[PDB]
């Protein structure tokens, strides 16, 4: 199943769509800069692209730890950003209020893996009609994510992208299973799988590491992928498209 | 640490405290009932003894399932509890505003695990200045509670409680790791810790399961144990159970530490 | 199933079973040494004991490190321990030839848990008619120990023991599941089952771990204790330690079971 | 480093090379029959290719399953596809004493995953100076493979191949961490990586899918090799697959400084 997000065909025997942007949203200034370098870069080897922040960090190391702009202002910045390069967005939401909001302003809004099977949450997402990002928990098994799609269908939202973050490994470990992918499509009607390197290396040189995870995965056939920015995002996503365009050409088995 | 909970007193070293009750509060007769037997098991014992309940379980396996008699109802059931029996009650919260009115009926406030890293929730359970059980995530390592317990800390309240549900184990497993308990009473200042055994097994005759892992738990010299019955323990097994651990509690607490 | 080991009684609800000894056999007067401290504390305390020991290192990370005193010197100072103090005794076999002539001497032998799988070695070691231990791999779930034990059934040798030494948990740790020996217990007709908590904390002061860890297998009711010190706990900690172990063995095995 | 086998080169930046073959030798016969199979397949698509096969298998599932042919007539089997087929061959050895035996004619020696710790092997394996290949226990983690090649380096042997077959990952299941292969190359002298994907997945259309999808995940990573334990037409289908990947993979330079 494909998604049209407006220009943009996401889906598994797709052309890759890159989500990436910034941690948290901090100034308008700042954001405008970064995504577009994004932009530049992704226009430049022809890569459909999604810029990702978050108006909010939830999980602050301290309980004064900068918050981010907050939702108001970060709604400002992500208009300002759609206008000026006229791409779509996506951001997190933590909590069934902000949802209707959010999916004003943002094309695709993401449900936080910790929250995952928070069911408010899940309702009141699903209830924008908005395309929606789906982060697998660290700890759920990907043929149960079957489970989280059914309450979305049930609750009437079917614009759904599942998001594969890695998994729990002994203490303070991810791993990710190449094969969890497969499992999801299998399972999951062939929604589309995009695969979020960052969070997935967040407790493992690194630029080499994050390549080649990005690679293996992409390998197995995925609509996207998520990454953090010498020309190093370039580098990467020379390679990224070169494997994607081999891999798409291939017919499936 | 110890913890005064209305008279009584939670701690590593102190006879253990049983956290019981129900999944979600359905109705005031059936938690009456429920509440009761609980009572009559403990108070035959003397087994120290809180009830516990969610109002809104924010958790379900459907999204129409039913969450609770909400927090209005909830927060009443909970008054009648503690008129009809005099023992302190134990509940969730899932938002900040739940806080406050929570925190006026319950003596207990509970930081769902998957909650346990948002900062707002923190620092408005923190900010009641009630006692709070902090869920272990079960992908956090137990060298890591300490970072939830800081927050706490920062925003004023250190009257905290950390329970054990288990760990991780490949997929949609879980384990228990004994060694957490002292790494947390270690790293966090020895807190009491209390054990959930039933979340710890749910992904796992049975009642043969949660003997055998509570006892190991308690083996390791604990401050309380959770757990959950169906009117899950059977109900009716209750004093059994409870027989076996207050034995084993008991010889474990009258040795001194080594 | 209860296991006779000379005057020994073997089994999940007899009084536990001390297998103690050494990580490796370096000369007779250590060992007499070692051994008669392990002797006297556990038959003061009225502990059944078995003296364990390897007289090879089959898999040290030097190929230059010493690896004990080997088979033939190995074998006479396990003919002077059961001489002079009259207990069975228990070592690890690496080689098929090895078999017969350590089952000679050896009361118990004892299958390394990286060998479990090869089948050369299990034939061989049933044919010896011993008493075998076997180490669950740290890679093997306990509903799959059953495999093991049918390869030895197979093998024509019911005599075995199962000794649970931890799980892999992520890279480089290890943890050990309470509830796998109930699954060993139940799956494999109720052998004897050990606890080694030595092994199962090598990836993880210590004197309080391996206590807290051991207490905690106890509590499920099991056969035995495998464990080592050195002059592994210190040794003079055993008296105590093990004082601590009896009292919760003694109180578990005094309930009846259900 | 790569390692010369024979007119193979293996190695991380080398063309894939092929490890495939049967489980147990039972006979000339059918070994040059199942050889052939996979000789035919990889010469119409030029890749590189080693017949294994056990001749004693120590770690089957069953006490009395047939452990193979056995030393003596093993190694005339090997000889014999060696003449036919003008192909290196690896098999494994557990026994100290068959390590030079074995060696005068194989290529390859393996070293069985389970018995890699066990140092008199390691010593008798290092000491035929033949190409060794290290089975990668499920229970040891990437960054203490060099522990092994350092036993092999003391013991005079650096031809060593390091092969992949997952880790344990909570009870019964096995999964590959695709960052392993990464830091055994860093951490064991960039030695050549292959991997066994087939073992990788004994514990999980279906499993031919499942291969395919795991295979091109590694081999994305770079590695020397490909390694499957035990149509013809689907073997095709799937180093087709492979072989795309790692030509692109493997005509591009290593990431810049
Ligand atoms: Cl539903
Ligand atoms: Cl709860
Ligand atoms: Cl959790
Ligand atoms: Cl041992
Ligand atoms: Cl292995």
């Not at 999604?50 to 939702?71: C, E, T």
């Not at 400002?76 to 209020?97: L, R, S, Y």
């Not at 303070?172 to 497969?182: P, R």
Request: with cysteine; hydrophobic share 40%.
């Amino acid at each position: 199943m494909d998604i049209k997000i407006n220009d943009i065909t996401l889906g598994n025997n797709s052309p890759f769509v890159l989500f990436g942007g910034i941690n948290v949203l901090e100034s308008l200034d700042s954001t405008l800069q970064t995504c577009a370098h994004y932009v530049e870069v992704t226009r430049k080897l022809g890569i459909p692209y999604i810029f990702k922040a978050s108006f909010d960090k939830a999980n602050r190391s301290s309980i004064h730890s900068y918050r981010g702009v907050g939702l108001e202002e970060g709604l400002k910045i992500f208009e300002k950003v759609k206008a000026e390069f006229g791409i779509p967005v996506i951001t997190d939401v933590h909590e069934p209020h902000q949802c209707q909001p959010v999916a004003e302003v943002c094309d695709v809004i993401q449900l936080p893996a910790r929250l995952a099977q928070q069911t408010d949450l899940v309702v009141a997402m699903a209830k924008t009609g908005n395309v929606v990002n789906i982060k697998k928990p660290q700890g759920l098994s990907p043929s149960q994510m079957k489970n989280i799609v059914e309450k979305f269908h049930e609750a009437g939202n079917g614009k759904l992208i599942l998001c594969e973050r890695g998994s729990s490994f002994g203490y303070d470990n991810l791993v990710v299973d190449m094969l969890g992918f497969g499992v999801m499509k299998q399972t999951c009607g062939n929604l589309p799988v995009i695969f979020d390197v960052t969070h997935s290396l967040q407790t493992r040189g690194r630029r080499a590491q994050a390549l080649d995870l990005a690679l293996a995965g992409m390998a197995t056939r995925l609509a996207g992928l998520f990454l953090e920015s010498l020309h190093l995002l370039e580098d990467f996503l020379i390679r990224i498209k070169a494997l994607d365009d081999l891999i798409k050409s291939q017919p499936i088995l």
